[PDB]
Amino acid sequence: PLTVEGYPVEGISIGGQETCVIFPTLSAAFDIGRCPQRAVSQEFLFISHAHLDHIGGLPMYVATRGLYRQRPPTIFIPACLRDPVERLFELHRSMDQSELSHNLVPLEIGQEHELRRDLKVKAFKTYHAIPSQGYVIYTVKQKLKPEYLGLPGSEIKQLKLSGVEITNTLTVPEIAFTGDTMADFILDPDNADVLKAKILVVESTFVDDSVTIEHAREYGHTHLFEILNQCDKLENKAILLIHFSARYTAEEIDIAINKLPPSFRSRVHALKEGF
Amino acid sequence: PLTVEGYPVEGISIGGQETCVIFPTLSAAFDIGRCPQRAVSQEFLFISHAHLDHIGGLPMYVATRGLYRQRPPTIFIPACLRDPVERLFELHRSMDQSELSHNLVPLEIGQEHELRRDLKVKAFKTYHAIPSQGYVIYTVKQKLKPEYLKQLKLSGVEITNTLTVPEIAFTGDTMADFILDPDNADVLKAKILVVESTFVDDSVTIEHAREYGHTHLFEILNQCDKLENKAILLIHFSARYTAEEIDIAINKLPPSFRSRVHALKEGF
Ligand SMILES: [Zn+2]
Ligand SMILES: [Zn+2]
Ligand SMILES: [Zn+2]
Ligand SMILES: [Zn+2]
Numbered sequence: 001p002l003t004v005e006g007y008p009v010e011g012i013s014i015g016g017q018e019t020c021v022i023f024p025t026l027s028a029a030f031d032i033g034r035c036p037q038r039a040v041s042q043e044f045l046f047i048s049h050a051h052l053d054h055i056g057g058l059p060m061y062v063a064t065r066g067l068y069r070q071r072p073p074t075i076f077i078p079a080c081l082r083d084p085v086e087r088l089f090e091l092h093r094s095m096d097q098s099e100l101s102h103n104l105v106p107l108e109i110g111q112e113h114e115l116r117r118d119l120k121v122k123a124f125k126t127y128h129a130i131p132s133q134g135y136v137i138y139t140v141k142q143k144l145k146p147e148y149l150g151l152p153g154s155e156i157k158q159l160k161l162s163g164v165e166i167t168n169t170l171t172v173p174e175i176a177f178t179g180d181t182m183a184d185f186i187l188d189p190d191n192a193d194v195l196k197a198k199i200l201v202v203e204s205t206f207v208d209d210s211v212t213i214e215h216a217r218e219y220g221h222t223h224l225f226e227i228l229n230q231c232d233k234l235e236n237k238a239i240l241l242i243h244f245s246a247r248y249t250a251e252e253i254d255i256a257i258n259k260l261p262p263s264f265r266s267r268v269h270a271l272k273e274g275f
Numbered sequence: 276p277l278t279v280e281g282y283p284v285e286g287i288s289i290g291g292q293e294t295c296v297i298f299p300t301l302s303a304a305f306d307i308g309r310c311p312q313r314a315v316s317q318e319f320l321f322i323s324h325a326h327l328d329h330i331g332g333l334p335m336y337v338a339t340r341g342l343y344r345q346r347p348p349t350i351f352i353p354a355c356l357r358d359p360v361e362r363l364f365e366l367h368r369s370m371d372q373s374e375l376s377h378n379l380v381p382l383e384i385g386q387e388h389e390l391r392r393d394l395k396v397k398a399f400k401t402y403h404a405i406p407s408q409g410y411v412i413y414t415v416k417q418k419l420k421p422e423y424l425k426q427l428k429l430s431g432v433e434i435t436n437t438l439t440v441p442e443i444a445f446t447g448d449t450m451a452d453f454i455l456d457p458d459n460a461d462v463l464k465a466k467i468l469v470v471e472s473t474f475v476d477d478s479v480t481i482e483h484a485r486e487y488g489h490t491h492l493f494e495i496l497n498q499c500d501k502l503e504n505k506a507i508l509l510i511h512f513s514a515r516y517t518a519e520e521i522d523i524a525i526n527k528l529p530p531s532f533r534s535r536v537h538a539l540k541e542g543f
Contacts (some may be wrong), residue, residue, distance in 0.1 A: 016342060034332065034335060050370035052334055052370075053335070053338075056335045060327050060331035063327040064327075084369065084370050094359055095360075096330075097405055130372055
């Protein structure tokens with residue numbers, strides 16, 4: 001199984017067909033594809049945009065969690081999609097008489113929401129043919145202050161009783177997911193945290209010269225050549241490339257990645273499920 | 276692969292998760308599940324009811340046929356679903372900014388629709404927790420009358436007979452009461468009956484299957500002589516089962532019934 005910077009990664013992203021990228025240790029799915037069964041067990045769903053290959057599985061995801069008596073999921077969407085997504089769920093309810101319980105959380109670009117005491121999300125601007133946004137998940141953890149770092153637990157414990165503040169809150173961009181986008185998201189000055197996230201999940205719909213950059217840009221997509229051109233500004237520990245055109249074989253993908261300069265290439269991974 | 280009375284059968288049916296049963300030589304999908312890629316090449320989609328494990332894949336199926344430049348599919352639904360399904364397409368059209376071209380055919384129970392010169396479908400009543408119907412596909416062929424095996428053709432005598440044969444019956448989700456409905460006689464004569472048996476052994480009672488609008492294998496067994504089908508294809512087993520448990524249950528059936536039973540075990 002695929003693992004990136006310690007995180008298992010599941011799911012699939014074929015450029016024409018479906019995109020659902022799953023981080024099961026975060027209970028997170030980035031887009032819903034055709035509702036792969038592995039996605040059903042994730043409590044948090046982040047929708048980048050309303051193309052059917054990204055959003056089409058949404059009602060089935062909610063319905064299946066309901067059937068299995070799982071906690072209603074929390075679903076993050078661009079704010080402008082709240083209207084149609086409400087309409088969608090009410091239509092299905094009007095037919096199938098089910099509850100389709102969920103928490104729908106519209107986010108505008110730059111807005112944040114808490115997933116858990118130690119986890120939060122922030123939406124960021126992406127550049128695509130229809131309304132869209134990416135998401136950065138941040139860890140929010142307590143870390144020992146420098147002066148207490150090398151200290152026996154017994155000692156730490158008494159400091160706790162006395163009531164000393166012994167930790168600092170550390171907020172770190174952990175996973176950044178673009179969904180479909182042009183490479184210009186990299187140049188948007190609001191996106192600095194995207195470029196420092198431990199893992200960047202970004203589409204590279206086209207990876208070799210069989211397709212031209214400006215053609216990639218024609219449909220709101222990114223060419224691997226553009227990621228390379230900007231690689232010096234990508235401070236991510238890992239880059240997970242997704243959403244390759246269905247025209248490609250897995251071996252073509254590997255070839256394209258292998259051709260990258262070695263220092264950058266060492267940080268590059270590919271989600272090849274289904275290729 | 277799975278072949279039933281000469282028909283390749285593809286797709287998947289897992290109770291509560293996804294149902295899409297594909298007869299590719301008929302360009303037919305019975306329900307759409309989560310839109311398995313194999314379904315996209317079928318030009319005919321027959322929807323039994325609106326539960327999301329049966330209908331959720333619908334917009335993706337239409338969208339993908341458009342991307343491949345295949346003809347807009349003809350989609351059959353219970354007549355009562357016409358307004359909300361029309362609306363659903365309009366809503367996805369707006370969201371994905373795509374045409375989602377299709378031909379929606381509301382079919383009332385008993386109504387028929389010509390699929391090909393030699394093929395037609397008819398809806399039939401099923402008994403489920405929400406409105407539902409099954410479908411029977413008939414062949415319609417012209418064959419020389421036995422006696423003649425030109426001057427009679429010129430004279431304008433009918434020398435052929437039009438033979439209408441029930442070929443595939445698909446129930447979708449239903450209680451076994453579909454067997455009792457006298458309007459469903461042809462269902463019980465179809466060459467292949469594709470019927471759900473959500474539960475297949477005594478770990479669950481018949482009554483429990485019925486509470487949720489489903490059929491227990493035991494009910495089919497207990498009425499097996501009413502079924503004149505050449506083949507019975509069981510589908511929609513509860514996800515609690517393994518393939519081995521399904522095979523065990525079928526193996527217990529009496530030889531006359533057992534010889535005609537097949538199961539769609541994909542994913543089990
Ligand atoms: Zn896409
Ligand atoms: Zn898109
Ligand atoms: Zn079902
Ligand atoms: Zn049902």
